[PDB]
Amino acid sequence: TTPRFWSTPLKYCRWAARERPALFFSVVIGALGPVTLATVPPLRRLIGDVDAAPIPLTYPIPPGPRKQLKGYDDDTED
Template sequence: MSAIYRAIQRTAHEQPVIFYSLVIGFTGPALVFAVPPIRKRMGWQPVERIPQTFPVPNRPRRAVAGFEDA
């Protein structure tokens, strides 16, 4: 275990770009599982879904008058 720690520490000092790229790369997938429970615990609720159709009134339709092109 000590050898792994030293290898990681050496990589962080000698090749910081590679080290931090790997850190960010492994953090992303971990956040997929960590963030939703944290958001739920903090009281976040999803927004209401956008309507996919226009609501049709519940009454008989009247013919339009006065806008003919004739």
């Protein structure tokens, strides 16, 4: 009486929603993970929702040679 998935895929899906709701919708929620991983970030780019840059978690050492500053030397003390 229970439908078979590989012969009639859609009929099985309706039965599982109605007769095994906890198992069926776990698979549906579990599959929404990958679905939003494919839809939203492309969607967000189009609307202009840009990703924030990472915050610094270490001292941000400036790239390049040292600037050769002249100021606040020892003669400036006192």
